[PDB]
Amino acid sequence: MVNWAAVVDDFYQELFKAHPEYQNKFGFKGVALGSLKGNAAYKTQAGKTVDYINAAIGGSADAAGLASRHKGRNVGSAEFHNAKACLAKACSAHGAPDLGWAIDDILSHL
């Protein structure tokens, strides 16, 4: 099976390297990027991100609901366009299919 957990870990490394301020919105705010793997808040969040990817692929993802929840954190189209770029890099590093179409689905509700 595709190692989505690894892809997700690379995604967050890219995302927070390019936009460290995004990290302030999470429970692992202020935690050094190289140490996120040992952080409990991060582990939970990464697992949910992996779950969402598997749900998008599986056909059960609620993109409208995810979009609405991100709006509820003042995270919008600009952030998701940046995310799309970091996720594209992360997917290629692991021989994984691109997930741009899934981010587009979320963006369609933002």
Burial of 28 (0-12, 13-18, 19+ CB in 10 A): buried
Binding mask 24-53 for ligand HEM (x = CB under 6 A): -xxx-----------------x--xx--x-
Kindly state the smallest distance separating residue 110's Cβ from ligand HEM, in Å: 11
Kindly state the smallest distance separating residue 14's Cβ from ligand HEM, in Å: 11
Give the sign of the dihedral formed by CA 56, CA 58, CA 61, CA 63.
positive
Query: Per the annotation, does 94 bind a ligand?
Result: no
| Footprint on this chain of ligand HEM (rule: CB under 6 A) | 22, 25-27, 45, 48-49, 52, 66, 69-70, 73, 75, 79-80, 83, 87, 103
